[PDB]
């Protein structure tokens, strides 16, 4: 019968290693698992064991991938046709695997002999270790677990290595496949789809296994790309074909990205850039003036009702707090900054937050969402009101945020359950507090010592406040009255966020009795203050506050050090508070110590207190704008930001602007009209993998557009054929692929000729050899290639049979080509055309078939061939799927042509075809197609216009309108993309590290050709050597430098080496050393040697770039999120990061380039992952960000004006 295999990935299941075979986050059944189950079925059928049965698989095809569920079981049916020697593997009656399988009757041990390498005796002592091998594999999308990690050693090119034999036939062969795909230059996931022949002989496999010193038997694997053969032990795979597997967007982590910027404690004029708020305020003022003498919002409606005319106000009170003006600061960064300040001055991660009068406050829908990005914050929010029913309408909302409920009138003392709160939030803009003094006392008592009060209110004497008072005529209080009341209840104002229309967020703190503070200056360059800090923090009984001071050395990293010390066991409540004076300009005078400013700071007792350009405040995180930045550029292309989404189509800045290597053999042509082809939308809808297109293409560039029309460098009207990137504002092509647009033609019409007519001429004339008077069968005759072939054939006086799928297409073809008769047309949507042809050729058939159809239509087209018939395959589905073609049509002297006009871009002879097309232009044989023109801004519409298939002729995106002034005589808003000129040298300090190598690869893919990688010890690992070798082989001038940036002379020398290659355009500080440990373990030398790679190194890089790099474009430093928020155990790391950030802010303030990226945990590569953080484990509440996401985030960050940006992934 049929063998049933119940694949269960359970712990006690005998097949549990399969959970370790993870590809793009989904547990996929290995392609070798099917081979193993078929082998078991065959062994059962022939009565032998698996280890006693040498086997041969042939023409194995994998039709679909089986996803193993987390829980449950997948049933696989294996059916053997022994007489046919074939097998079949099905999931639920759906074909999964097909091929042939049979016993190896005469096993050949000589088949399992390692072929000689094409480049032998490499003399390379460096090989890829198992950790490096699987780091590289995981970078490509292969999350293989420990069971599927059998490659314990590999050569730098992947042609040879060692495979660990764990008595598993699935894992061993899967590691063979990993070895085959390791040396592949292709990028991304590549899953096996077809394997020509697998020969497995366990008899020689046992004898070819040798045990190492670890007593673990291994085999030697050799991959010959020349022979296309992988041999390991007794396994020999030949003809393995791997097809690209798109990476699922579900596995794509969504990272939270913030900007880390300075904000003063007192802010005024907030929300001024909001035009809607200004318009609403103007309308309210006009309504108030009319009463004394957008518009659909609650406040304008109430004002209009009052103008028309108590009852109305009572009815509209519930919707009053939701007004945009009354909630402007509630939906503003000021509230987020105040919340961050509150959670910053906290004993531990616990956050006890209580809201007063939540019925009209509506702070339950913003505060927990705003504090959600905090990774380790434990939030306890309680919504309280005098009347519980007022919260009923918000009940469901209170269920969404897990907010507790309670009853408490502000005029009465708080309940004991609500006492000792950490944060108290009120929104009394609409709600009435009653007696301000009694209430203020009530939640002064309710708040614990050191707690924070955040109240959003309206100020009397202001437009919004005056309007509210007039409408309502306890009540609206002025700022002076509010401050006096705060002083009455012993509240110290630490924050002030005032809008333009008067609404204000007051932040107050309850003072805590503290002894005389100890002032510790942490500005010493020798880092001798760390010993004093350890000594003062060595005691636990004393709780006297310790104020860190950084009056000198404005580029001090005290912020990161303090943030890291807060969550340490020593100093959580010992008040490790800082005082930094970071003046971004020398014009602003500094704040003298021992004066009233320090007294005010102590009175506020805010943990983060920085003086910047006259302002007193702190560095806070803010949510980054979700919109991708756009710039006006003359060079842009069309890209699908998310694969398969036609709505994601956008104009992205191209690499043709920053780098313009105008040299003979290439030409920068301005694109006026670019046509869309079938391949473009097979790319844009995800049906065709971008890597399937031949050519050296990176994983970032878009391949939309194979042809274009427009102007040239000299301004002549030209049209062109390109392998890719033709859908752009400008295109770089050789003149070998250029034709001159004739005067009678329009640039719009000419943008339809290149691809279709070149393909028709190559298939018909070059390969088909269409002699005049012959009989042709042209499929999709209404298409582009079809119309071109019809025109050529009618020029040659040929009988033509065009297959079209519509009556309108028939009519258009008849009108366009009057030489075609009613018998010239058949149906392309069914096999029927075959009979039609076989009827009108007298059963002889057609001489030439221009076939773009597939499957049964392809077979019918083959059956239409006459004797000496030429079959020109223009389509690719049956070619790509390796569909069998019956080799009996060749008995009719038939020649089968696989016509692909894509080898002309990576090989020649193309000129012949070129000449033909030019001839067709001269004779009038080449006639422009019908063009459906879409504007450049509507490109996506065009992409979804002909994908429906109703288009006739060609669809053309009008990138630029043709000027009628002459035939010989462009800024657009495009998404900013980071591209680097080839004439600039880019330095990556620490570029040989984990993040360094991947950043170098990303920069190289972005156009960097002169690269300088700085390492303290040069190349040591096989992975580093392999990456450097690949970069050098592909043309990048990567240079490994031992020069250390920690010394000024070392930085100068490094910049000199970079300038030797070319002008310095980018400096990337990724150097880092780890001296992590608790503060009592910390030593001054540890801080010195940690800050030297990062702080002193960045200072030296700053100085040298200022003095010797006038053309610098990128000055990027990679800090950690430990500085932004805090991580216990690494205080020196945080100090170095914060100092780097201050350096970058100083650089950016003066106009020079500067960027500090506060990375969270990095997943694919790094240092913490390689040592002991396998896969992506929750580290400090932040998940390890994947490298692809890291590179996209860096690309986004590099095109922003913000000095310091942070990115991490929530757990
Ligand atoms: N191998 C090579 O060198 C090259 C091959 N080509 C191939 O030529 C074939 C056709 O290309 P081309 O003629 O320019 O494409 P067109 O957009 O001009 O039209 C293709 C024809 O295919 C039919 N068709 C079937 N399904 C669709 C659909 N979903 N959308 C639009 N049309 C559809 C239509 O004819 P009807 O609907 O009446 O059946 C249409 O007229 C493609 O398979 C393409 O891969 C193109 C260039 C080079
Ligand atoms: N991966 C992560 O978890 C996180 C990383 N980052 C940032 O990522 C960047 C890269 O670190 P990462 O790739 O992760 O870890 P790595 O250990 O792999 O990279 C550190 C590299 O920097 C080298 N280096 C050390 N000192 C110097 C120096 N003075 N000059 C030049 N090179 C030096 C290191 O020493 P050597 O030459 O001996 O090899 C090592 O090569 C750092 O900025 C780091 O702060 C930020 C947050 C998290």
Curated annotation (Swiss-Prot):
Active site: which residues? 21 (proton acceptor), 174 (proton donor)
In which tissues has expression of this protein been reported?
Ubiquitous. Prominent expression in brain, lung, liver and mammary gland.
Binding of NADP(+) 1 occurs at: 776-793
The region called C-terminal hotdog fold is annotated at: 124-251
Compartments, record wording? Cytoplasm; Melanosome
Q: Which residues cross the membrane?
A: none
* Annotated region described as Beta-ketoacyl reductase, given as residue ranges: 967-1211
Q: PKS/mFAS DH domain: from which residue to which, for each copy?
A: 1-251
Span list, region N-terminal hotdog fold:
1-109
Q: Positions modified as Phosphoserine?
A: 295, 516, 689, 699
Post-translational modification, as annotated: S-nitrosylation of Fatty acid synthase at cysteine residues Cys-576 or Cys-1190 is important for the enzyme dimerization. In adipocytes, S-nitrosylation of Fatty acid synthase occurs under physiological conditions and gradually increases during adipogenesis.
Q: Which residues carry this modification: N6-acetyllysine?
A: 135, 809, 876, 950, 1094
Chain intervals for the UniProt region annotation (Enoyl reductase): 740-966
User: What is the role of this chain?
Assistant: Fatty acid synthetase is a multifunctional enzyme that catalyzes the de novo biosynthesis of long-chain saturated fatty acids starting from acetyl-CoA and malonyl-CoA in the presence of NADPH. This multifunctional protein contains 7 catalytic activities and a site for the binding of the prosthetic group 4'-phosphopantetheine of the acyl carrier protein ([ACP]) domain. (Microbial infection) Fatty acid synthetase activity is required for SARS coronavirus-2/SARS-CoV-2 replication.
Other noteworthy facts: The relatively low beta-ketoacyl synthase activity may be attributable to the low 4'-phosphopantetheine content of the protein.
Question: What is annotated about its quaternary structure and interactions?
Answer: Homodimer which is arranged in a head to tail fashion. Interacts with CEACAM1; this interaction is insulin and phosphorylation-dependent; reduces fatty-acid synthase activity.
Question: Could you tell me what this protein is called?
Answer: Fatty acid synthase
Name the gene that codes for it: FASN
């Amino acid at each position: 019968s049929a063998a049933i295999y119940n694949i269960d990935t359970s712990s006690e299941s005998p097949d549990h290693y399969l959970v370790d075979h993870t590809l793009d986050g989904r547990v996929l059944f290995p392609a070798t698992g099917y081979l193993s189950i078929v082998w078991k079925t065959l062994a059962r059928a022939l009565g032998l064991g698996v280890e006693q049965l040498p086997v041969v698989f042939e023409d194995v095809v994998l039709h679909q991938a089986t996803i193993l569920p987390k829980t449950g079981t997948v049933s696989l049916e294996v059916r053997l046709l022994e007489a046919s020697r074939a097998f079949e593997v099905s999931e639920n009656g759906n074909l999964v695997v097909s091929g042939k399988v049979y016993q190896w009757d005469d096993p050949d041990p000589r088949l399992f002999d390692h072929p000689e390498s094409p480049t032998p005796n490499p003399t390379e002592p460096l090989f890829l270790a198992q950790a490096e091998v699987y780091k590289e594999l995981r970078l490509r999308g292969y999350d293989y677990g420990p069971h599927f990690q059998g490659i314990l050693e590999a050569s730098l090119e992947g042609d040879s290595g060692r495979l660990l034999w764990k008595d598993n036939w699935v894992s061993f062969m899967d590691t063979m496949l990993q070895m085959s795909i390791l040396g592949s230059a292709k990028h991304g996931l590549y899953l096996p789809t077809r394997v020509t022949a697998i020969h497995i002989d366990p008899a020689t496999h046992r004898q070819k296994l040798y045990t190492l010193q670890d007593k673990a038997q291994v085999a030697d694997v050799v991959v010959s790309r020349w022979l296309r053969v992988t041999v390991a032990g007794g396994v020999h795979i030949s003809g393995l074909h791997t097809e690209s597997a798109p990476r699922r967007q579900q596995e794509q982590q969504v990272p939270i990205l913030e900007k880390f910027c300075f904000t003063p404690h007192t802010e005024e004029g907030c929300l001024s850039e909001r035009a809607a708020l200004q318009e609403e305020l103007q309308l309210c003022k006009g309504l108030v003036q009319a009463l004394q003498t957008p518009s659909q919002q609650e406040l304008p409606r109430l004002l209009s009702a009052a103008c028309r005319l108590a009852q109305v106000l009572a009815q509209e009170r519930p919707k009053l707090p939701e007004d945009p003006l009354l909630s402007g600061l509630l939906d503003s960064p000021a509230l987020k900054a105040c919340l961050d300040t509150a959670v910053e001055n906290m004993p531990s991660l616990k956050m006890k937050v209580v809201e007063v009068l939540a019925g009209h406050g509506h702070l339950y829908s913003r505060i927990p969402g705003l504090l959600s990005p905090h990774p380790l914050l434990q939030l306890s929010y309680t919504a309280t009101d005098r009347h519980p029913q007022a919260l009923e309408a918000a009940q469901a909302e209170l269920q969404q945020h897990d907010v507790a409920q309670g009853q408490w009138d502000p005029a009465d003392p708080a309940p004991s359950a609500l006492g000792s709160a950490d944060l108290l939030v009120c929104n009394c803009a609409v709600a009435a507090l009653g007696d301000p003094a009694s209430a203020l006392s009530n939640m002064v008592a309710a708040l614990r010592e050191g707690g924070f009060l955040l109240l959003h209110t309206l100020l009397r004497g202001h437009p919004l406040g005056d309007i509210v008072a007039f409408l309502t005529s306890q009540g609206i209080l002025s700022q002076d009255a509010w401050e006096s009341l705060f002083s009455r209840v012993s509240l110290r104002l630490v924050g002030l966020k005032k809008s333009f229309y008067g609404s204000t967020l007051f932040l107050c703190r309850r003072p805590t009795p503290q002894d005389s503070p100890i002032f510790l200056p942490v500005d010493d360059t020798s880092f001798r203050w760390v010993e004093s800090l350890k000594g003062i923090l060595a005691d636990e009984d004393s709780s006297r506050p310790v104020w860190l001071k950084a009056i000198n050395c404005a580029t001090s990293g005290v912020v990161g050090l303090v943030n890291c010390l807060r969550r340490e066991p020593g100093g959580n409540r010992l008040r490790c508070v800082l005082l930094s004076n970071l003046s971004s300009t020398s014009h602003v005078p500094e704040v003298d110590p021992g004066s009233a400013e320090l007294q005010k700071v102590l009175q506020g007792d805010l943990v983060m207190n920085v003086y910047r350009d006259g302002a007193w405040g702190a560095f806070r995180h803010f949510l980054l704008e979700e919109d991708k930045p756009e710039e006006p550029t003359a060079h842009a292309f069309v890209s699908t930001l998310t694969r398969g989404d036609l709505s994601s189509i956008r104009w992205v800045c191209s690499s043709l602007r920053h780098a313009q290597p105008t040299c003979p053999g290439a030409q920068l042509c301005t694109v006026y009209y670019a046509s869309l082809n079938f391949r473009d939308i097979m790319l844009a809808t995800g049906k065709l993998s971008p890597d399937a297109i031949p050519g050296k293409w990176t994983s970032q560039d878009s391949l939309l557009g194979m042809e274009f029309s427009g102007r040239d460098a000299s301004g002549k009207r030209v049209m062109g054929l390109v392998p890719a990137k033709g859908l752009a504002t400008s295109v770089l092509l050789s003149p070998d692929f250029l034709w001159d647009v004739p005067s009678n033609w329009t640039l719009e019409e000419a943008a339809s000729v290149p691809v279709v007519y070149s393909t028709a001429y190559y298939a018909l004339v070059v390969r088909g050899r269409v002699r005049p008077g012959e009989t042709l069968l042209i499929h999709s005759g209404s298409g582009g290639v079809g119309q071109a072939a019809i025109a050529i054939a009618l020029s040659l006086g040929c009988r033509v049979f065009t297959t079209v799928g519509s009556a309108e297409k028939r009519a258009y073809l008849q009108a366009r080509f009057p030489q075609l008769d009613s018998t010239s047309f058949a149906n392309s949507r069914d096999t029927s055309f075959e009979q039609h042809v076989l009827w009108h050729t007298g059963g002889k058939g057609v001489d030439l078939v221009l076939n773009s159809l597939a499957e049964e239509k392809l077979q019918a087209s083959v059956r239409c061939l006459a004797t000496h018939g030429r079959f020109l395959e223009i389509g690719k589905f049956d070619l790509s799927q390796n569909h069998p073609l019956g080799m009996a049509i060749f008995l009719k002297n038939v020649t089968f042509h696989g016509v692909l006009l894509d080898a002309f871009f990576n090989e020649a002879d193309w000129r012949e075809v070129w000449a033909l097309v030019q001839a067709g232009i001269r004779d009038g044989v080449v006639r422009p197609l019908k063009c459906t023109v879409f504007h450049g801004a509507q490109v996506e519409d065009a992409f979804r216009y002909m994908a429906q298939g109703k288009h006739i002729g060609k669809v053309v995106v009008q990138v630029l309108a043709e000027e009628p002034e002459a035939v010989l005589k462009k800024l657009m808003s495009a998404i900013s993309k980071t591209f680097c000129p080839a004439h600039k040298s880019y330095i990556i300090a620490g570029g040989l590290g984990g993040f360094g190598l991947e950043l170098a690869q990303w920069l190289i893919q972005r156009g960097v050709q002169k690269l300088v990688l700085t390492s303290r010890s040069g190349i040591r690992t096989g992975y580093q050597a392999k990456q450097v070798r690949r970069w050098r082989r592909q043309g990048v001038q990567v240079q490994v430098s031992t020069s250390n940036i920690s010394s000024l002379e070392g930085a100068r020398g490094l910049i000199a080496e970079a300038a030797q290659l070319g002008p310095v355009g980018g400096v990337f500080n990724l150097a880092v050393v780890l001296r992590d440990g608790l503060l009592e373990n910390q030593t001054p030398e540890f801080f010195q040697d940690v800050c030297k790679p990062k702080y002193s190194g960045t200072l030296n890089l700053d100085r040298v770039t200022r003095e010797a790099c006038p053309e610098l474009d990128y000055f990027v430093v990679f800090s950690s999120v430990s500085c932004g928020r805090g991580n216990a155990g690494q205080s020196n790391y945080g100090f170095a990061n914060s100092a780097m950030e201050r350096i970058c802010e100083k650089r950016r303030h003066e106009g020079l380039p500067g960027l500090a990226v506060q990375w969270g945990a990095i997943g694919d590569v790094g240092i913490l992952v390689e040592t002991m953080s396998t896969n992506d484990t929750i580290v400090s509440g932040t998940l390890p960000q994947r490298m692809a996401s890291c590179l996209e985030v860096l690309d986004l960050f590099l095109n922003q004006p913000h000095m310091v940006l942070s990115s991490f992934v929530l757990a």
